[PDB]
Amino acid sequence: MTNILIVEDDPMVQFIHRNYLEKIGTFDTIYSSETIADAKKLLASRSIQLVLLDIRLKDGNGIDFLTDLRRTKQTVDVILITAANEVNIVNDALHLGVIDYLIKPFTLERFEKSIQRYRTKH
Amino acid sequence: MTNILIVEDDPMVQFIHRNYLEKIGTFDTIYSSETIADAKKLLASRSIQLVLLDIRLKDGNGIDFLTDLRRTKQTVDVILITAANEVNIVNDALHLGVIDYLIKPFTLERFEKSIQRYRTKH
Ligand code: BEF
Ligand code: BEF
Ligand SMILES: [Mg+2]
Ligand SMILES: [Mg+2]
Alpha carbon of B99 to those of A18, A34, A68, A103, B42: distances in Å? 18, 21, 17, 23, 38
Chain B residues within an 8 Å CB radius of A112: 20, 24
Decide: A3 and A29 in contact? Cβ < 8 Å.
yes
Scanning chain A, the segments in alpha helix (DSSP H) are 11-24, 36-45, 62-71, 86-88, 108-121
Chain A residues within an 8 Å CB radius of B23: 108
Phi first, then psi, for residue B72 (nearest 5°) are: -90, 0
Q: What are the start-end ranges of the E strands in B1-122?
A: 2-7, 27-33, 50-53, 56-57, 60-61, 77-82, 100-103
Segments making up each domain of chain B, as ranges: 1-122
DSSP 8-state secondary structure symbol assigned to residue A5: E
Using CA atoms, how far apart are residues B99 and A4, in angstroms rounded to an integer?
14
Of residues A74, A23, A80, the one with CA closest to residue A52: A80
Decide: B75 and A53 in contact? Cβ < 8 Å.
no
Technique used to solve these coordinates: X-ray
Q: Which of B13, B106, B112 sits opposite A24 (nearest CB)?
A: B112
Using CA atoms, how far apart are residues A99 and B76, in angstroms rounded to an integer?
11
Ordered DSSP codes for B89-120: IIIIIS----SEEEESS--HHHHHHHHHHHHH
Which residues make up the environment of ion ligand 4, defined by Cβ < 5 Å?
B 9, 54, 56
Query: Within chain B, what is the greatest distance between any pair of CA atoms?
Result: 56
Q: How many alpha carbons lie under 13 Å from residue B106 in its C-beta half-sphere? A: 21
- Residues 6+ away with beta carbon under 8 Å from A111: A102, B20
**Number of other residues whose CB lies within 10 A of the CB of residue B118:** 17
A12: three-class secondary structure by DSSP: helix
